[PDB]
Amino acid sequence: ASVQIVYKAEFXYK
């Protein structure tokens, strides 16, 4: 598990 960051615009650990 680790930090996840997404860009979709939308822009955010699992």
Place this chain on the structure above:
Amino acid sequence: ASVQIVYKAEFXYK
């Protein structure tokens, strides 16, 4: 359709 970029570490239009 939108550009999608993910960072989780590794880093990639739908």
